[PDB]
Amino acid sequence: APFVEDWDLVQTLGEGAGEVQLAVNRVTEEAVAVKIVDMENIKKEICINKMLNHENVVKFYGHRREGNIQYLFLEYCSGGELFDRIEPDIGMPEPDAQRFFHQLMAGVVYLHGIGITHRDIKPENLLLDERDNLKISDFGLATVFRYNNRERLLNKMCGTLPYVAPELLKRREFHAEPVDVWSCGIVLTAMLAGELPWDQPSDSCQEYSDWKEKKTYLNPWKKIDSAPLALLHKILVENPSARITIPDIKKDRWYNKPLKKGAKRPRVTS
Ligand SMILES: C[C@H]1CC[C@@H](NCc2ccc3c(c2)Cc2c(-c4ccc(C(=O)O)cc4)n[nH]c2-3)CC1
Known part of the structure; x- marks a missing residue:
């Protein structure tokens, strides 16, 4: 043709x-x-x-x-x-954020399952199709962290500072998967509060120290309901070995809370 x-x-x-x-x-x-x-x-x-x-x-x-x-x-x-x-400063309805968060986890589970780490998860890189289905995009910083069932530890500094895990700034080497889990938690924070919690996850950063000191009466945390906030408490854990894994995120109470109705389908009455 x-x-x-x-x-x-x-x-x-x-x-x-x-x-x-x-x-x-x-x-x-x-x-x-x-x-x-x-x-x-x-x-x-x-x-x-x-x-x-x-x-x-x-x-x-x-x-x-x-x-x-x-x-x-x-x-x-x-x-x-x-x-x-x-x-900005609002976020989006909590059921929309939950659906987007479920689709983001599905994509990250898939990538980690084939041994790929994205390394730059942020809303600028999460695209939406015609049905508002989330798609992870841009594999320009992506790398192989598991090959022939052997994990390779990462040491390259990359990503976007407000979304990076604190171990990238404090440790020479780190596991790839908890890094992507952290960036997903910051995406969830942005979706629920319309603001990023800190410029970077360092002790020199007052907003980061406040979070570690559980000052959740402050913004962005004050705008987030207790059920999604309890999940963020498990994701945004400084020690990447203590940070929640995706299989445990799938068991979280908010993650499994029925909130979002399916897409509006054509209907008539009588
Ligand atoms: C709203 C302004 C900003 C850009 C355009 N609209 C937003 C938009 C609409 C649809 C998009 C993208 C952006 C970016 C993109 C991609 C895409 C695919 C893959 C990569 C990649 O692999 O890097 C990057 C971007 N696919 N579809 C789209 C028009 C003007």
Whole structure:
């Protein structure tokens, strides 16, 4: 079928690093996101993307290299970033945050299960499809932490300071999985309070010391109900060996609290 390999670049979706363009197929009008990288780091990113196949992870369709430029064909998530669903200083309704948190855990369980750590979990990187299904995106900082059933400890400093686990700032080496668990807890905090608790998790940071001293009568914690706050108390634990694991997050009371009705379906009366 002629022209089916042709895609029109119609809208800029993101910048930094190059750019992410919305691509529309000339024939079928299928929409995909094309990541344009001018163009070792991209080689690893493509290699990790080729491993991925889960409903809460951005789909990787393939890649093409046009000399110095790499084109990554990825899922278009029309709902945009989770970030834009967070109202500043407010957050979002607690049932919406719980549903997004369940979908985030499903994606993180999948990635950890195949031995991949994302390392930069934040609302700017959590995309939403047409049905507001969350998808983990951007595997540019991702790495393999388990291979041939052997865990490799990490030592590379990366991520985004307000979302990073304190062990990345205090220890030479650390386990990969509790780092992603921590960043998910900060995403949950942002979703429920519309604000980030600290600039970074260090003792020099007053808001971080207040949290460790259980001053939950202060913001952002005062805006969060006792059931989700009890989960945050288990996630945002400084010692990564004492921090709750995802299998235990799945047993948490709030995590299992019925709160959100399914999507509004067409109905009539009489
Ligand atoms: C609202 C302004 C900001 C960007 C656009 N809307 C938000 C939006 C809407 C849909 C998006 C993205 C962003 C980013 C993106 C991606 C995407 C996929 C994969 C990666 C990656 O692997 O890095 C990055 C981004 N897929 N769909 C979308 C238009 C103007």
